Amino acid sequence: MLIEIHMIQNHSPANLNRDDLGAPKTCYFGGVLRSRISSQCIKRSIRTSNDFKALLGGVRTRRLADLIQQEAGETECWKKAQEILNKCGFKNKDDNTKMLVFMSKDKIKDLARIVLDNSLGLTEAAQQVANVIAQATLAPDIALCGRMLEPNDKDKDKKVKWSNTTVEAALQVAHAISTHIARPEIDYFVAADDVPGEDAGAGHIGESMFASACFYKYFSIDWEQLVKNLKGDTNLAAHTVGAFLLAAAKTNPSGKQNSFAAHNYPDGILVEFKNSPISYANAFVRPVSVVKESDLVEQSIGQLSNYVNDIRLGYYDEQSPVIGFWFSPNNRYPLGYKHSKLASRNIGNLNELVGAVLDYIGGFKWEEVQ
Amino acid sequence: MLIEIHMIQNHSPANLNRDDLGAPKTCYFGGVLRSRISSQCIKRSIRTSNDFKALLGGVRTRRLADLIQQEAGETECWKKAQEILNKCGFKNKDDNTKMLVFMSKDKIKDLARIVLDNSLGLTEAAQQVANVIAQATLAPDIALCGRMLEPNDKDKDKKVKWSNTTVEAALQVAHAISTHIARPEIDYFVAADDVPGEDAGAGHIGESMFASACFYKYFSIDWEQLVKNLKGDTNLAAHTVGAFLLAAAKTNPSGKQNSFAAHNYPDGILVEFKNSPISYANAFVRPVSVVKESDLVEQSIGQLSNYVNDIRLGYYDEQSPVIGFWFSPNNRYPLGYKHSKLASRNIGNLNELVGAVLDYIGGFKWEEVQKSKA
Amino acid sequence: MLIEIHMIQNHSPANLNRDDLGAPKTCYFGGVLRSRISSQCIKRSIRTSNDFKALLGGVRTRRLADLIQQEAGETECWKKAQEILNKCGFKNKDDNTKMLVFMSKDKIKDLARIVLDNSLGLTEAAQQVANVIAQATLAPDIALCGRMLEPNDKDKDKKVKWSNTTVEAALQVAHAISTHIARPEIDYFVAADDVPGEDAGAGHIGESMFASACFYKYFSIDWEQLVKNLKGDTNLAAHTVGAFLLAAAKTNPSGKQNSFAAHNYPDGILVEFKNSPISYANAFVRPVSVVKESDLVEQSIGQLSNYVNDIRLGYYDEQSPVIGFWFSPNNRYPLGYKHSKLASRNIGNLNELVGAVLDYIGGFKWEEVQKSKAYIG
Amino acid sequence: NRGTVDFIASLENLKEGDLGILRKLRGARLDEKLPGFDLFSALWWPLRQKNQRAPKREVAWLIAKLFAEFRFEQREGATLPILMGGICRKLEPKKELPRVLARFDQLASLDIMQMEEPLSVIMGILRKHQQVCLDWVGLTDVLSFWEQEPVKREWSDSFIKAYKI
């Protein structure tokens, strides 16, 4: 069984996700230009959020020896351990190691034992370190996301021993795209001097960019293969699903928030349970033009309801039932589609829907799983 | 008799097929640049789907000796298996072993017996292995997708002593091409170090590419050739066609979906029954230009309807093999608001379309042929 | 009288005709690179096709001994028949069987009656076999593609005399060249192991060259020579012309058609009746370059129509009239609407085109000549 | 030369996005697509305005496209005739060798515009035989001065010297 989350959000002028030059990220969908927030940005915003701080047990550290000497003390062991890291397949690249490692937060302490194994160093230390790196995955975020960790070549040619470090997936996130044609802007900024007497008359204006849009996000959690990655811990998996729902509902990317401050909350969440993943992003192939009578969010929810109903009465099977909820704050935005109610249970509160999903999952509650 | 399936499928921004550089696969068609998905990717996605699990009767493998070891339960023959594989003379250069074997898994068990008879001669064991591999063509996937087996003549002892391994494929799949001019884009990503190092400001800005398009996909199935490939087993052929039509409309390539999750569904499927293969890819020789009124998918389906009508009224014959069903989810996209009905049954459900397809094939029911597994 | 058939045909990404290296066949026309499809490929595809099955009355094989062994096959006729045909003159140069014979397959069983006697001998049997092979040419496909049979004078026994085994071909087929600059493309396939293994440099980065192009194809048929080659069977000649047009319209070469599926019908067919052959390939000397206001096929048709108008005003004499029909499916591509009226029977059906062509040819009917079929085995 | 060396170094400084931009444009001119023109201009124009003997626009465009599709590391002493001679002296001399020899000899009758595709064929043959190095600078100079006789004489002489080892 697959758990699917579809969100619709509206943002004040924000510039949430930025290019390498400084422009907001855009894309093309349906032949028109749309504002886009990348999947990795959304995943990292959820990963280091506040509600997900309880289950955070992994680091994407690029300087693992600094973390090694950051806990066990004895910073001189950097020049005892870093070269050891250069032997496990990290190539001794431009940084401490340009191969980012994804690893559970506890096993660094185990690597501290490798620090004090001066009698069993060289090849034994490298092989033991490789064993810890390969067998450090039991974390609610590394199980949620993936981990490739293909070591760089030109390593030791004697005893480079590696297990299957690849952990497949449990969560797929699509690039959030707007439901309308994007209109990027330039904020012409200038740097005003404090003391009179600049004596500089020229073009000192600057160019900083931003845009505002209504985004459609799409998550998908596989209920199996997440418990499998968590080694049968059904309660930890239930807590992961609940806290992921919380964080994805109440976290936004921290990109230029000190100057735009667009902490907006979603006005609709649709949670489904089905055996095959479907993405309703094809609803907004036609751009959502705004009429005078309605607003952007209501029209977006209307088109989403249209497409959801057409999918429901279309690719419909008898062995596989579909049950869906529908969240909106105080039922402000119902799943608008004439007199047809689509979801089986309209919900007007967030924690109530989290409890409803959790107790559908097989009898889990938001009290004892934390 | 030929069953032809024409699809129109709009995809969200993703990278479903890449080359060795990492760019999405493209092509030129009509003088402009289009996005493209290879037919090998579509065939593999259909063959390894979840609506095709009961009919997955064949394996394409390079480590076949390991599979024979796993099904044999004895280690020693596995070593001799490679020797027999060496005595099979598949390939011993370039890509090391190479020479993929495509054969049914049940006869894998038979293979084990030929390596469990150590009393037989090694040359005779290799000859029987080659023989039982040559007969290993009882699988719905091998029947549809054909078979290649041309080993190397540089490793043989008793001359060739082979058999006929060529199987004429009953399924033709075209490369999917976008209906409009492609707009390839680059996504600039920087990996973030969660530990504060206060460095790496210009930390190797990467360059990952992606695109979005409305593809047109084309499949053709030969009924008589499939029946001849399945030893005249019509129960398995109807089930294979139905499960193929189900799996082709609900499976997408798995390339880069954990970061570009684009699990979209087809917007319009046309299934025709005729004796000669036709391809409607010439509808989109002039690329679809988006107007402010309609969208991409509606214009694509309108152009497809226009070209299908032109072909039907242009190459009319006395056989009248125009029996075709048009599918759209709850009749969301009708086959053009310009002509009359050109499809015999405007179907709005998927399993009803599959049932109608089987009823035209032989009058069988969808719940009647599902009991024949592989 | 000559029947000229010109076709403009656009194709999907495909690899219909290759060479020894796998790249699609190309050529240089007008100074620039164009995609090419050989004449032998088109002729072979037409010969072995569904719409030409009722007239396929000839075989071009290197194993006539095995064919006659399958035909008669009593006890041992294969070895003796092979020896007889080897002493006939079919030289085994460099141990190759060689000397592809192209006789009509309806006479093959008659050859059995020459190889089913144990008292005939060797040289007399070889002479009789050569005599029955030489004067066996009544076939619609042989009358079109022609045949040359000149055995080398080393294995000949100097007692069997070879009569005339040369038939003038009544069909001229030009190579199909694209109407624009060729743009070859490379596909990088990688085979996948179904059973999971070690994903550490799986390799097998391949190279599959392919291209998509708008081709101009040109066929020509001589009516007098075809009738003479058939030995006065105007009914069978009319059936041959009609079924040749029907097959050449809806068929494609079978090269890599399981990986690609370029089963694309031609977007325009011109049929002209002249007294001298004329190729319109000089229309696309300047390559056709696409714009944003039109497509490739419409521009190709427009350029072809401009050149047809130029060769219809110039090089025109009333002493030899020219009559032509233009066919596009449901009139979707008119013949270059800047002067119009280039053809006279702009229509939108293939079978109506075949019928009108037959009525102009002899006042025949398509439903009448279908019972004049050749050896239908 | 120095404009050629700087041009090759700039071409190898590119990343996957710009290499894909150039790879999408094989078989096309320079005045057709704006992104390709912008990338090539921003890579080539400062070198032309600095060095007087920089490669011409057509030659530099051809080398850019060939590097895009057939990325080979720059090494000295790995010229095209030498590698073609090394490959050619491994096949039978009756059928395959005359075919490869004719493919190599077609280049002498072609100008610089109609030479992307035969060179692509030759480099595909090189890539099929596990080659990972090429001399881009020497090929660029040879293509820059091509219609002369001594350059073709040296080309064929290098081919003979590699073939008759």
TrEMBL record, chain A:
Protein name per Swiss-Prot or TrEMBL: CRISPR system Cascade subunit CasC
In which organism is this protein found?
A: Candidatus Cloacimonetes bacterium ADurb.Bin088
Whichever gene encodes this chain, its name is casC
TrEMBL record, chain B:
Name of the protein: CRISPR system Cascade subunit CasC
Q: Which organism is it from?
A: Candidatus Cloacimonetes bacterium ADurb.Bin088
From TrEMBL, chain C:
- Domain of life according to the entry: Bacteria
Protein name, per record:
CRISPR system Cascade subunit CasC
User: What organism does the record attribute this protein to?
Assistant: Candidatus Cloacimonetes bacterium ADurb.Bin088
Q: What is the lineage of its organism?
A: Bacteria, Pseudomonadati, Candidatus Cloacimonadota
Automatic annotation (TrEMBL), chain D:
Q: What is this protein called?
A: CRISPR-associated protein Cse2 (CRISPR_cse2)
Species of origin: Candidatus Cloacimonetes bacterium ADurb.Bin088
